[PDB]
Amino acid sequence: KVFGRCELAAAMKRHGLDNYRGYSLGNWVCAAKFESNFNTQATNRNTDGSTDYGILQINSRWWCNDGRTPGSRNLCNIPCSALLSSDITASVNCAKKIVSDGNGMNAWVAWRNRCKGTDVQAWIRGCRL
């Protein structure tokens, strides 16, 4: 599913991401924009053989099982395919664990490089929330 901007902001708020670990909703929307362009079916293969999945491009090295990332973990206890669902529950729940890991949203390199320190509120501007 490709979400609209405000549609995703609302879904993320529904699932409790607004101000989760102190990160305002705009941060989460901005991260999703640049990770996946709001596409739940987004995948990207990494140089190390791990794969990133879903709207927030969550990596199989640590967070999900895809059966093809040697030596990896599955800390969110889910198949990586769950991260591709039209239902964002699994992505959100796993993102909560990731952002609690110690480095906050810096875990998402695209957030650090493209969202961090910008006017992220613009991402939810105009949305009915």
Question: And the tokens for 73?
Answer: 């973990």
Q: How far apart are the C-alpha atoms of 73 and 6, rounded to whole Å?
A: 33
- Confirm or deny that 87 is annotated as ligand binding: no
Q: How far apart are the C-alpha atoms of 23 and 121, rounded to whole Å?
A: 11
Q: What is the experimental method?
A: X-ray
This structure's resolution (Å) is: 1.5
CA 3 from centroid of its chain's CA atoms: 13
Question: And the tokens for 16?
Answer: 């409790």
How distant, in Å, are the alpha carbons of 13, 62, 64 from that of 75?
23, 6, 6
Q: Is 35 a catalytic residue?
A: yes
Q: How far apart are the C-alpha atoms of 85 and 44, rounded to whole Å?
A: 16
> Active-site residue among 7, 18, 48, 52?
52
Q: How far apart are the C-alpha atoms of 53 and 59, rounded to whole Å?
A: 6
CB proximity list for 42: less than 8 A, separation 6 or greater: 35, 36, 52, 53, 54, 55, 57, 84
Question: And the tokens for 88?
Answer: 């964002």
Q: Name the DSSP letter for residue 120.
A: G
Q: Is 52 a catalytic residue?
A: yes
Start-end of H helices in 5-88:
5-14, 25-36
Residue 95's CATH number: 1.10.530.10
Overall number of domains in the chain: 1
CB proximity list for 125: less than 8 A, separation 6 or greater: none
Q: Pairing mode, if any, of strands 51-53 and 58-59?
A: antiparallel
Q: How far apart are the C-alpha atoms of 118 and 105, rounded to whole Å?
A: 14
- Which residues constitute the domain of residue 48? 1-129
How distant, in Å, are the alpha carbons of 58, 59, 65, 69, 70 from that of 32?
11, 14, 21, 23, 27
Whether the CB-CB separation of 83 and 58 falls below 8 Å is answered with yes
